[PDB]
Amino acid sequence: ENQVYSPVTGARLVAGCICLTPDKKQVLMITSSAHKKRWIVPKGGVEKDEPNYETTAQRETWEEAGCIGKIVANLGTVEDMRPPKDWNHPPRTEFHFYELEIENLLDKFPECHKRHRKLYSYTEAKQNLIDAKRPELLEALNRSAIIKD
Ligand SMILES: O=C(CP(=O)(O)O)O[C@@H]1[C@@H](OP(=O)(O)O)[C@H](OC(=O)CP(=O)(O)O)[C@H](OP(=O)(O)O)[C@H](OP(=O)(O)O)[C@H]1OP(=O)(O)O
């Protein structure tokens, strides 16, 4: 619709955040809208108007998790290497991830009724993304400044 794709791989361009607490013991996570039981991290599709990936990230973090913070690091890109449904390979999604230091969480936000939202230690957060079958999101988490204990 209004989405943007890599001119090389034709993959859909996404940006998101690893929203860490100030102490950096916990990371904010949200539930998928399609898969209502899977815990992921805030991200969404880049739109034409958006000048940089930081814009898409901070927007998507707000819309999806009602989270406000400053980007303290670029974590680089990870790919969603998901084989096409008629599989029985070019990547599906390129994600541009930033580390964000949480300044505030709001009780209202545009998908406050469509998603849940919780802070998880590195351990619980690792298992959640295993359960979710999203290792490219775990790769991003690992590039963060999160404490591993
Ligand atoms: O499920 C997947 C892809 P995967 O099954 O991991 O290969 O992602 C959907 C995405 O559709 P797709 O085009 O297949 O990537 C969904 O996107 C689309 O439907 C866009 P399109 O159908 O490709 O135009 C949508 O992703 P975006 O947030 O980036 O929009 C879904 O996110 P949701 O809104 O449910 O949180 C996202 O699910 P998830 O990341 O598990 O939460």
3-state secondary structure the chain: CCECECCCCCCEEEEEEEEECCCCCEEEEEECCCCCCCEECCEEECECCCCCHHHHHHHHHHHHHCEEEEEEEEEEEEECCCCCCCCCCCCCEEEEEEEEEEEEECCCCCCCCCCCEEEEEHHHHHHHHHHCCCHHHHHHHHHCCCCCC
- Among residues 128, 117, 100, the alpha carbon closest in space to that of 21 is found at 100
For a ligand 1 pocket test, name from 93, 109, 130, 131 the mutation site with the most ligand atoms within 8 angstroms of its C-beta.
Answer: 93
| Beta-bridge partners for 56 | none
Q: Which two tokens stand for residue 112?
A: 């406050």
**Torsion-angle region of residue 7: left (phi > 0), alpha (psi -120 to 50) or beta?**
alpha
- Using alpha carbons, list the distances in angstroms from residue 61 to 10, 79, 81, 90: 24, 19, 23, 27
How many whole angstroms separate alpha carbon 89 and alpha carbon 82?
8
Resolution of the coordinates, Å: 2.7
Please state whether beta strands 67-79 and 93-105 pair in parallel, antiparallel, or not at all (unpaired). antiparallel
Q: Which two tokens stand for residue 32?
A: 């998928």
How many whole angstroms separate alpha carbon 41 and alpha carbon 37?
13
Q: Which two tokens stand for residue 4?
A: 């943007």
Residue 48: CB atoms within 10 A of its CB come to 7
Structure method: X-ray
> Can you tell me which atom of ligand 1 is nearest the CA of 32?
42
> Gaps (C–N > 2.5 Å) in the chain: which residues precede them?
88
Side chain identity at 143, as an amino acid letter? R
Residue 7: CB atoms within 10 A of its CB come to 6
Please state whether beta strands 93-105 and 117-121 pair in parallel, antiparallel, or not at all (unpaired). unpaired
Please state whether beta strands 12-20 and 93-105 pair in parallel, antiparallel, or not at all (unpaired). parallel
Where are the chain's structural domains?
12-143
Give the residue, by CA position, lying nearest to ligand 1 atom 36.
32
Q: Provide the CATH number for the domain formed by 12-143 in this structure.
A: 3.90.79.10
Ligand 1 lining (C-beta closer than 6 Å): 3, 12, 14, 32-35, 40, 44-45, 80, 82, 92-93
Q: Which two tokens stand for residue 143?
A: 């590039």
What is the CA(92)–ligand 1 centre distance, in A? Answer: 10
Give the residue, by CA position, lying nearest to ligand 1 atom 7.
82
